[PDB]
From a paper:
Protoglobin (Pgb) is a recently discovered haem-protein with distinct structural and functional features that make it unique within the globin superfamily. The MaPgb* structure can be considered as an expanded version of the 3/3 helical sandwich typical of “classical” globins (i.e. Mb), with an additional N-terminal extension, built by a 20-residue loop, followed by the Z-helix, which precedes the globin-fold conserved A-helix. Residues belonging to the Z-helix contribute to formation of the Pgb homodimer, which is centered on the intermolecular four-helix bundle built by the G- and H-helices of the two subunits. Thus, in Pgb the access of diatomic ligands, such as O2, CO, and NO, to the haem is granted by two orthogonal apolar tunnels that reach the haem distal region from entry sites at the B/G and B/E helix interfaces.
The Tyr(61)B10Ala mutation has instead a dramatic impact on the accessibility of the haem distal site since it increases the average tunnel 2 diameter by more than 1.5 Å (6.0 Å is the shortest distance between Ala(61)B10 Cβ atom and the surrounding residues). As a result of such increased accessibility, the tunnel 2 entrance site (i.e. roughly the cavity left by the Tyr→Ala mutation) in the Tyr(61)B10Ala mutant hosts a glycerol molecule (in both chains A and B; the glycerol molecule bound to chain A is modeled in a double conformation) which is able to H-bond the haem-Fe(III)-bound cyanide (distance of ∼2.8–2.9 Å, depending on the protein chain). Thus, in the Tyr(61)B10Ala mutant, the haem-Fe(III)-bound cyanide molecule is stabilized by the interaction with the Trp(60)B9 Nε2 atom (2.92 Å for chain A, and 2.90 Å for chain B), and by the additional H-bond provided by the glycerol molecule which mimics the H-bond provided by the Tyr(61)B10 OH group in the MaPgb*(III)-cyanide structure. As a result, both the orientations of the haem-Fe(III)-bound cyanide molecule and of the Phe(93)E11 side chain match those found in the MaPgb*(III)-cyanide structure. Furthermore, the presence of the Trp(60)B9 side chain within the haem distal site affects the orientation of the haem-Fe(III)-bound cyanide, but does not impact on the ability of the adjacent Tyr(61)B10 residue to reorient its side chain toward the haem-Fe(III)-bound-ligand, as demonstrated by the structure of the cyanide-bound Trp(60)B9Ala mutant. Similarly, the Tyr(61)B10Ala mutation does neither impair the Phe(93)E11 ligand-sensing mechanism described above, nor ligand stabilization provided by Trp(60)B9. Higher accessibility to the haem-distal ligand-binding site due to the Tyr(61)B10Ala and Trp(60)B9Ala mutations may also partly contribute for the increase in koff for cyanide. off for cyanide dissociation from Trp(60)B9Ala MaPgb*(III)-cyanide and Tyr(61)B10Ala MaPgb*(III)-cyanide species are closely similar to those reported for cyanide dissociation from Mb(III)-cyanide and Hb(III)-cyanide complexes, where ligand stabilization is achieved through the distal HisE7 residue.
Numbering used by the authors:
A (entry chain B): 5 to 195
B (entry chain A): 4 to 195
The structure:
């Protein structure tokens, strides 16, 4: 198993539904063309995940105010926390590429938002760490997530056109997800 | 000659986020002095194309009833006065993003723009009757179509793909940065 990974088995139903999802996909310009290319992105990234995770960890770890969110109260990084999240983040790369974007997917998107937010942060791994990840950084991270993926998307010999389409699909899907993850952060009724 | 409703540098509130917050947020979006240079270049490329850009942007918003919704009168039809007034301020925002120093005045206006999408100030600037709040989910979503809209225009002055990529990436970073700041009035106090 992947510890803490509970896709399909969340305690809550998401507060957004399939119509909300359709409308949000429209807002990020996501179509059947992106369904095709996000799946291809999975195929390309799957065997590169260790290097992708090393790069992502390098980014977070190089900024004290970001590594902060994985620290124990004494200010030192909690390596068990980092390692447990790494395994779930690795799986998220595959889920983004392979899962149907349906009710189960929406339920887990609500869960991931809850886990960055004070509602559930630190509970999954039973760690003691900072209580909340400020929302400002969830939005900001859309950029470095896409920048991290981009070079890896070129490494299986796909055409420049195909690489660009995979990258754009990844950007749309990341944006879509972060928008959903805002739910527990947003003043009730303003989402 | 004054753009109605455009109050850059003269807003009523100091932003709740400061220049140190901004430094740290720039780090999170990988925005550096290099991007300052490339966003200025993007400005130079985009400036004389703004009418086409605005038509393209309006076309996207107008293409989906649930998006055009945010500019509608109670009868469900677009408020053309509202669209036209916002268009002029959006045109200016393209230039500001490219040309202003991201300093305290800039931060203060980012708080203002957030407040104007939010129920706090929406519809007050133009004194219109429209929908009370733009759901935050769409502000985040729109990071994508903003970048997709700018991309082809960034290539229309003969720059190489490598140069267009640097301008595009700078625009993407700067748009993300701004939407992150605009979340402030939407986010539960203490969670931003
Ligand atoms: C585009 C934005 C982001 C993406 C795509 C992302 C991705 C993920 C994923 C896939 C997980 C595991 C979800 C699961 O439990 O199955 C996770 C958890 C986590 N992320 Fe992020 N993340 C983002 C923003 C952030 C930011 C800004 C930080 C600040 C460093 C951060 C730090 C963490 C932490 C500390 C956890 C563990 C939360 C917990 O205690 O459950 N993430 N993230
Ligand atoms: C990346 C996201 C967005 C960007 C860059 C953007 C840009 C802008 C700008 C520059 C303005 C004028 C600011 C000023 O008053 O000086 C504005 C206002 C406005 N925008 Fe957006 N916008 C975004 C998201 C959205 C969304 C999702 C909608 C929904 C259709 C929307 C609809 C509106 C409306 C209705 C106004 C007028 C608000 C008021 O009553 O003052 N915007 N936007
Ligand atoms: C999150 N990493
Ligand atoms: C906003 N348009």
């Amino acid at each position: 198993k992947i510890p803490g990974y509970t896709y399909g088995e969340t305690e809550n139903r998401a507060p957004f539904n399939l119509e909300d999802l359709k409308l949000l996909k429209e807002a990020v310009m996501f179509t059947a063309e992106d369904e095709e290319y996000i799946q291809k992105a999975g195929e390309v990234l799957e065997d590169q995940v260790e290097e992708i995770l090393d790069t992502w960890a390098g980014f977070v770890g190089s900024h004290p105010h970001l590594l902060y969110y994985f620290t124990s109260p004494d200010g030192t990084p909690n390596e068990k926390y980092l390692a447990a999240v790494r395994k779930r983040f690795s799986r998220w790369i595959l889920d983004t590429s392979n899962r149907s974007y349906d009710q189960a997917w929406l339920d887990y998107q609500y869960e991931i938002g809850l886990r960055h937010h004070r509602t559930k942060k630190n509970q999954t791994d039973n760690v003691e760490s900072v209580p909340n990840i400020g929302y400002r950084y969830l939005v900001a991270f859309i950029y470095p997530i896409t920048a991290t993926m981009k070079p890896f998307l070129a490494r299986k010999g796909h055409t420049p056109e195909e690489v660009e389409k995979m990258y754009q699909a990844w950007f749309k899907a990341t944006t879509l997800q972060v928008a959903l993850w805002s739910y527990p952060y947003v003043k009730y009724g303003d989402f």
